[PDB]
Amino acid sequence: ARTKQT
Amino acid sequence: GVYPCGACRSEVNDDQDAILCEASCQKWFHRECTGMTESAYGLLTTEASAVWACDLCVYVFTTHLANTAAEAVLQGRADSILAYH
Ligand SMILES: [Zn+2]
Ligand SMILES: [Zn+2]
Structure with missing residues (x-):
């Protein structure tokens, strides 16, 4: 899932 | 940031x-x-085949399911969060 940590 | 948070409507910064x-x-x-x-946030980040669905609205996770699944993974009860999709 796309997060800012991606 | 350019985008506002879908819940609190304030800016989301990177x-x-x-x-x-x-x-x-x-x-x-x-x-x-x-x-x-x-x-849950960490484990979702690195699972390419998981997507998250917010409260207002491939393996789909709500917050509750991602939270339950992460607790199981960290306790060795589940191999990955995908077991809770
Ligand atoms: Zn917010
Ligand atoms: Zn949504």
Whole structure:
């Protein structure tokens, strides 16, 4: 899932 | 930031924890506006075949399911969060 940590 | 949080409507900056509702509305949400744990956020980040669905709206996870699944993974009860999709 796309997060800012991606 | 250019995007507002889909829950609190304030800006989301790239140095905040935030997740995209890829399952549906494609809005960003601050982690802390969703109730998502730090562990669910970390495990979702690295699972390419998981997508998150926000409270307003491939393996789909709501916050509650991602939180339950992460607790199981960290306790060795589940091999990955996908077991809870
Ligand atoms: Zn917010
Ligand atoms: Zn959504």
